[PDB]
């Protein structure tokens, strides 16, 4: 005769918070519209 | 020779939603070059 018994238990708790916050302010005063605008672009000139 | 049996309960519940919304409005400057900035910053 044979009697067998068994349990498997398992958990997989996985969490992955991720965040970016980016604030860019450009202020340009004086000069020509063309340069005022391209200076007002988000990259350094 | 053999008899084999089973039964049970299956459950699935889903909620899935995706929203994408872009606005690119350019006021002032010539039609063509304002349109170019509207299309491709």
């Amino acid at each position: 005769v044979g009697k067998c018994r068994g349990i498997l238990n398992e958990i997989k708790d996985r969490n992955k918070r991720d965040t970016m916050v980016e604030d860019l302010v450009v202020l340009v005063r004086g000069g020509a519209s063309e340069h005022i605008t391209t200076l007002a672009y988000q990259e350094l000139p | 020779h053999c008899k084999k049996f089973g039964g049970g309960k299956t459950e699935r519940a889903r909620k899935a939603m995706a929203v994408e919304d872009i606005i690119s409005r350019v006021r002032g400057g010539s039609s063509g070059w304002s349109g170019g900035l509207a299309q491709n910053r």
Partner: peptide
């Protein structure tokens, strides 16, 4: 599961849950 016939009982219980959130906002 028991044998002298050989006969078995098996039980299963599970909860598989998945959640995702993804937010992007940019204003120029």
């Amino acid at each position: 599961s028991d044998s002298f016939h050989s006969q078995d009982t098996s039980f299963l219980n599970e909860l598989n849950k998945y959640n995702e959130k993804k937010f992007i906002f940019t204003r120029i």
